[PDB]
């Protein structure tokens, strides 16, 4: 058994260093060369608000079992995660660190770390996935409070106490830190916007949401108050162990791919708990995507088993908006869900409509008689008002997934509508720019239709199609329909 300061980092990282000529990003989608240059206990800046430094905690806060699942992690990053926990946490609050090695190619990545004080290693004999692995770690846990971390994190100053203090006060709170960013290229540790929290669109993939004006006003008035959130962000949360068990742990029929925070966030909120972000708790994390998952695309299928298991149990009739967004999922097998249905019945949970109204009212729900909804996409761009009002041109702009000027519907009256403005064919000559004008129910100039498997938008009663070829020249136009890239448009939801 070795105390973490005596652990031989250079021998552990060892023969796994990147050779010259090898892709530094190959092991786990971040730059391993730079990860390997850091020490295991490298200093990081204290990104907490100044008020957080004036907080004191009882010595009798409940200890936690920290459960870290991993699969083919970069050794330097896995070791720095473990050391961060040990270095930054009051030792008495760390009952144990349980590493659950989810069938990594080399079992030494984990086994060598089991020499460290407090570190226990459980190795799965096949790839089970994060959710099943977390259940294994949780069943093995000795403490009364579970802490789940991912395998490429770095805990900051007094990260743990604020989380435990919330759960010790009310066992129904499931709580997370603010996630700071560890850059995937250069490994610098920095803070992100304080006005971002976890969310999702009807495709049910995680996204960052920008707080509304009310929420931002509220945050300004106390930047260290706990923040309620509709969806856990990241790999990271603390939960009373008995509450985790009572609520149904994780669904053990989930597989490797996607959905890790979806089912649990719905279940916690619907079945009477809550999700919080705790600003005085900071943990940095290496995010590995540069862009959102593309939809349409293959991800909708890759994530469908786990996503359907969430939607079919929890979402009631709202699952239909998910299938509107991800029609490729509609027929993907997802296994029997009777026991999870039984759990929901046993726990007396609220309907999804209640979740939408009380927990996530910012998720906008299509009108009952909308034909299509969401954003109107063309490649990675979206139909956009460019901030214009009546008589202004419309445009196209990089899809930002933030709603706003990119929020549209195709209404029962066949209009393409944003707030009370509608796309209007003010001039039928081919080439002419279209304009935003007030929606009027019987204006033939404002009628559009999806054509060709919902891949274009034609002006009803015409051979004119919406066309971005004029976007450099002033905005979108009507153009003679033809086989042009600039005439491809598709709503994210087809109802």
């Amino acid at each position: 058994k070795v105390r973490w300061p005596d652990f031989n980092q250079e021998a552990y990282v060892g023969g796994t260093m990147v050779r010259s000529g090898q892709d530094p990003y190959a092991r786990n989608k971040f730059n391993q060369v730079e990860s390997d240059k850091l020490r295991m206990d490298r200093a990081i800046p204290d990104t907490r608000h100044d008020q957080c430094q004036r907080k004191q905690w009882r010595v009798d806060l409940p200890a936690t079992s920290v459960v870290i699942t991993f699969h083919n992690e970069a050794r330097s990053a896995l070791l720095r995660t473990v050391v961060s926990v040990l270095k930054k946490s009051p030792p008495h609050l760390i009952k144990e660190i349980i590493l659950v090695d989810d069938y990594s190619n080399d079992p030494e990545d984990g086994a060598l770390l089991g020499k460290i004080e407090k570190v226990r290693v459980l190795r799965n004999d096949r790839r089970e996935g994060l959710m099943r692995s977390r259940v294994r770690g949780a069943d093995a846990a000795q403490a009364k409070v579970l802490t789940f971390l991912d395998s490429h994190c770095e805990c900051n100053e007094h990260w743990l106490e604020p989380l435990l203090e919330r759960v010790a006060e009310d066992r129904t709170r499931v709580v997370s830190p603010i996630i700071d960013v560890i850059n995937m290229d250069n490994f610098q540790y920095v803070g992100a916007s304080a006005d971002l929290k976890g969310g999702f669109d009807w495709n049910l993939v995680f996204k960052w949401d920008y707080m509304t004006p009310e929420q931002r006003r509220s945050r300004q008035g106390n930047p260290v108050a706990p923040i309620k959130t509709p969806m856990i962000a990241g790999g990271l949360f603390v939960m009373d162990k008995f509450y985790f068990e009572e609520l149904g742990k994780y669904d053990m029929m989930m597989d490797v791919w996607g959905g890790e925070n979806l089912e649990i966030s719905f279940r916690v909120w619907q079945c009477g708990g809550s999700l919080e972000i705790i600003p005085c708790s900071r943990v940095g994390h290496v995010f590995r995507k540069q862009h959102p998952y593309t939809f349409p695309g293959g991800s909708g299928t890759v994530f469908a088993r786990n996503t359907r298991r969430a939607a079919e149990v929890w979402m009631d009739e709202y699952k239909n908006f998910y299938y509107a967004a991800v029609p490729s999922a509609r027929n993907v097998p997802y296994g029997n869900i009777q026991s999870r249905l039984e759990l929901r019945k046993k726990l007396s949970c609220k309907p999804f409509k209640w979740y939408l109204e009380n927990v996530y009212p910012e998720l906008r729900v299509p009108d009952h008689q909308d034909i299509a909804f969401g954003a109107l996409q063309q490649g990675t761009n979206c139909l956009d008002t460019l901030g214009h009002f009546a008589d202004g041109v419309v445009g196209v702009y990089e899809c930002h997934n933030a709603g706003g000027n990119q929020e549209w519907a195709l209404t029962k009256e066949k209009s393409v509508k944003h707030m009370d403005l509608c796309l209007t064919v003010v001039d039928r000559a081919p080439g002419s720019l279209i304009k935003l004008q007030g929606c009027r129910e019987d204006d033939s100039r404002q009628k559009w239709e999806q054509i060709e498997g919902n891949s274009k938008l034609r002006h009803v009663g015409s051979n004119l199609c919406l066309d971005s070829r004029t976007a450099k020249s002033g905005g979108l136009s009507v153009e003679v329909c033809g086989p042009a890239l600039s005439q491809q448009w598709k709503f994210t939801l087809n109802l």
Partner: peptide, 15 residues
Amino acid sequence: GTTPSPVPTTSTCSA
């Protein structure tokens, strides 16, 4: 492992 995720940002202009 976790499901790879985007770095925390949003649109850089306002609605």
